[PDB]
Design an enzyme around this catalytic site. Structure first.
Site, PDB file in Angstrom:
ATOM      1  N   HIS A 261       0.816  -1.205   0.000  1.00  0.00           N
ATOM      2  CA  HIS A 261       0.000   0.000   0.000  1.00  0.00           C
ATOM      3  C   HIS A 261       0.859   1.268   0.000  1.00  0.00           C
ATOM      4  O   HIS A 261       0.580   2.224  -0.730  1.00  0.00           O
ATOM      5  CB  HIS A 261      -0.909   0.016   1.230  1.00  0.00           C
ATOM      6  CG  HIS A 261      -1.449   1.371   1.563  1.00  0.00           C
ATOM      7  ND1 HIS A 261      -2.674   1.814   1.121  1.00  0.00           N
ATOM      8  CD2 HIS A 261      -0.917   2.391   2.280  1.00  0.00           C
ATOM      9  CE1 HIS A 261      -2.879   3.046   1.550  1.00  0.00           C
ATOM     10  NE2 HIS A 261      -1.825   3.420   2.257  1.00  0.00           N
ATOM     11  N   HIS A 266       1.189   5.303  -2.337  1.00  0.00           N
ATOM     12  CA  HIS A 266       1.653   6.584  -1.820  1.00  0.00           C
ATOM     13  C   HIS A 266       2.870   7.192  -2.501  1.00  0.00           C
ATOM     14  O   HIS A 266       2.801   8.300  -3.021  1.00  0.00           O
ATOM     15  CB  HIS A 266       1.952   6.452  -0.328  1.00  0.00           C
ATOM     16  CG  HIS A 266       0.763   6.673   0.549  1.00  0.00           C
ATOM     17  ND1 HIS A 266       0.026   7.837   0.527  1.00  0.00           N
ATOM     18  CD2 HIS A 266       0.179   5.874   1.473  1.00  0.00           C
ATOM     19  CE1 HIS A 266      -0.961   7.747   1.399  1.00  0.00           C
ATOM     20  NE2 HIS A 266      -0.891   6.566   1.986  1.00  0.00           N
ATOM     21  N   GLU A 306      -6.104   9.355   0.488  1.00  0.00           N
ATOM     22  CA  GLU A 306      -6.441   7.947   0.547  1.00  0.00           C
ATOM     23  C   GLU A 306      -7.394   7.482  -0.549  1.00  0.00           C
ATOM     24  O   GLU A 306      -7.085   6.545  -1.282  1.00  0.00           O
ATOM     25  CB  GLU A 306      -7.029   7.612   1.913  1.00  0.00           C
ATOM     26  CG  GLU A 306      -6.910   6.152   2.291  1.00  0.00           C
ATOM     27  CD  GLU A 306      -5.496   5.618   2.151  1.00  0.00           C
ATOM     28  OE1 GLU A 306      -4.532   6.411   2.190  1.00  0.00           O
ATOM     29  OE2 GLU A 306      -5.346   4.390   2.004  1.00  0.00           O
ATOM     30  N   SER A 325      -3.551   1.200  -4.915  1.00  0.00           N
ATOM     31  CA  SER A 325      -2.925  -0.023  -4.418  1.00  0.00           C
ATOM     32  C   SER A 325      -3.955  -1.131  -4.171  1.00  0.00           C
ATOM     33  O   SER A 325      -3.695  -2.089  -3.443  1.00  0.00           O
ATOM     34  CB  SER A 325      -2.150   0.263  -3.130  1.00  0.00           C
ATOM     35  OG  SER A 325      -3.025   0.631  -2.079  1.00  0.00           O
TER      36      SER A 325
HETATM   37 FE   LIG Z   1      -2.516   5.354   3.551  1.00  0.00          FE
END
Ligand SMILES: [Fe+3]
Ligand SMILES: [Fe+3]
Lengths: 403, 403
Positions: A261, A266, A306, A325
């Site tokens: 993730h 990110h 997010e 992700s």
């Molecule tokens: Fe996060």
């Protein structure tokens, strides 16, 4: 009451107290102040004086104290205010009456509560080998200190396989679903950071690459941090991220954020100046903000960093990390099923939601720059006795009074 | 022809070549470029690609090459210009026809020629113990690399005594002769950096304190560097400074700058945001500037950072480093004997002078901020195919085209 991404902060037995105040230079002024602390049984080690970055004739004071110095702080503040003559702001991890919620002023101060982390329904729960492996990663984080290189870890073929699975699927979706900025950087992460299907990149490598792009840096973290602590890190362009990987049993599910993730959802966007500035804006707004607004910033972060989508002309792409992700929801977010709303912080800030997969509704941002300005605007409504700004040269937060 | 402070640069057997160019993202674009290098026997280790900090749809390329790649560079540039389609600037340490004088683009690149340093008439010449001691300091510098802590050295009572002598005398002159900014910071250097009469401060301590003030940092250097190399460092807020001390035989004389000069004359002012910005402005203006202008910037630096005076109301104080660390001339510069002129870069840039003590004339600056703007203005007249700017986040120089 929905299991949101908001995590209230906790204080240790010592907590943290910081007295923000400056002092114009005057014969015996500096000696007076330091004498004031020293005379109150306060080790002058927790007292630091530096030249004011704003006014050439002033000194800025930094105090690394804790609940232990509470019995004397009162008199000390009074003395500073009435006798010495200075404007003082009291920061407290415990956020008590007349004190501002504590936040780090220097990048090094992110060490303080970096280890303040939040099983039976989670895969790998009854796996001793996995539970042991996880503790290993947690310990690397626990022992980590700012400025240190991030310990490299040799991942198992099984772990690398889990990564490979998630990688392949997402990489096949990026072109058509990922926002331009993500697709722009990815090829570089693949070329210079070992971002391959058969390889799990090392956090140190990723960190050095990030710093070289937007000055962003990684900090290994054991598990979930409080929203205040995590968002605040962003103010320093510091990303607290995990090093472990999900259990190889379920390669498409994670009760929490793992290396997959962090690295795939990110890192790419943190390498983009525009996105970095936008995310940093959220962190700066969280500095000293009341719990009520940390929660609101937490919700805003959820519907942006997010799970946010952005306009790409007449098209709509995804930039949210929880989307970039997760193949399943990455496909779903751009389907004709979810409800879309334009990014509007006053509304978004109070948007109700749950952490379960496939979000019913998403917020669309005009651009990262627009979103950033919106955050700036929203931040102005946050109740704090001053405004903040980050100094990349000294890597310290600048506290200028409200504008 | 007067023994000025200007030192022409030298190139190694390998020298240094850097191709500055960006590339808009296009299918196969990145692969084309890297293939172009790789196909010309150029290790793709000397080829780095990063996201453009200016345009979100471009890539910025950094090439760490040298004279070895000269035979192929021609074709490579042609290909980039005509075939691939990019604007390329060629940097060369040898400054040849159609190439811009080389300069580091990243802070790490200051390692390249940091060891490019420039006896019988100097004290300690026939002193074996001293000559050995000096080599020790030179080696610490030779082996130093950016990012590393600066090796601490235990100084002898004799050395500390030499320091003490210089200290006492100057400290007794500061109040009345030193500019406000110097006098403002000194007390902090005394309190937090071990700046005492009986103690020689460690470069690491001083460096950490500087970074915490203006982001300025020290880099141990063996001896004198070329003007281009030294001034260029300032652009990164990096001060190349010595660690050794003058020979204890003559505590009031130094054929070159020693730890006494660095710490007492330079460090205080580098801790001031205003001065740091001003000095950095000189470095940024030296980036890629022709020799003729490096020399002019060298002269400007001499009549400012080294031997400058500044208005303090109706008064005139000293801020020049060669003055703040020399009791004799510190007293003389403010006497009724020297001739004073207002800071005017067009004039100052061509001011004739010698490095012998007691300067016949000095230039008075309105303030560090005014001086800074004057440098900015003067820099615009410096012939270079682009303009530069420092990015404190990535610690890399930004090359934007001429404005
Ligand atoms: Fe996060
Ligand atoms: Fe000097």
């Amino acid at each position: 009451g929905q299991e949101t991404s908001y995590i209230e902060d906790n204080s240790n037995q010592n907590g943290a107290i910081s007295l923000i105040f400056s002092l114009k230079e005057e014969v015996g002024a500096l000696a007076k102040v330091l004498r004031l602390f020293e005379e109150n049984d306060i080790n002058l080690t927790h007292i630091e004086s530096r030249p004011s970055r704003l006014n050439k004739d002033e000194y800025e004071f930094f105090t690394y104290l804790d609940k232990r110095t509470k019995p004397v702080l009162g008199s000390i503040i009074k003395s500073l205010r009435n006798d010495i003559g200075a404007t003082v702001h009291e920061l407290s991890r415990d956020k008590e009456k007349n004190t501002v919620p504590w936040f780090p002023r220097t990048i090094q101060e992110l060490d303080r509560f970096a280890n303040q982390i939040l099983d039976a329904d989670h895969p790998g729960f009854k796996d001793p080998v996995y539970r042991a492996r996880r503790k290993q990663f947690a310990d690397i984080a626990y022992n980590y200190r700012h400025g240190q290189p991030i310990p490299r870890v040799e991942y198992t073929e099984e772990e690398k396989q889990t990564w490979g699975t998630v990688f392949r699927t997402l990489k096949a979706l990026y072109k058509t679903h990922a926002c331009y900025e993500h697709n722009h950087i990815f090829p570089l992460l693949e070329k210079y950071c070992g971002f391959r299907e058969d390889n799990i990149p090392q956090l140190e490598d990723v960190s050095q690459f990030l710093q070289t792009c937007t000055g962003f840096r990684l900090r290994p973290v054991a598990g979930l941090l409080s929203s205040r602590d995590f968002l605040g890190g962003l103010a320093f362009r510091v990303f607290h991220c995990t090093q472990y990987i999900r259990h190889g049993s379920k390669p498409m599910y994670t009760p929490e954020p793992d290396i997959c993730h962090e690295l795939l959802g990110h890192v790419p966007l943190f390498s983009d100046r525009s996105f970095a500035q936008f995310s940093q804006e959220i962190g700066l707004a969280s500095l000293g903000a009341p719990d009520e607004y940390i929660e609101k910033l937490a919700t805003i972060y959820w519907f942006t960093v997010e799970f946010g989508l952005c306009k790409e002309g007449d098209s709509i792409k995804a930039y949210g990390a929880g989307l970039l992700s997760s193949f399943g929801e990455l496909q779903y977010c751009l389907s004709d099923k979810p409800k879309l709303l334009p990014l509007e912080l006053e509304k978004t800030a109070c948007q109700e939601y749950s952490v379960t997969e496939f979000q019913p509704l998403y917020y669309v941002a005009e651009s990262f720059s627009d979103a950033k300005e919106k955050v700036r605007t929203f931040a102005a409504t946050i109740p704090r006795p001053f405004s903040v700004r980050y100094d990349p040269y000294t890597q310290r937060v600048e506290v200028l009074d409200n504008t």
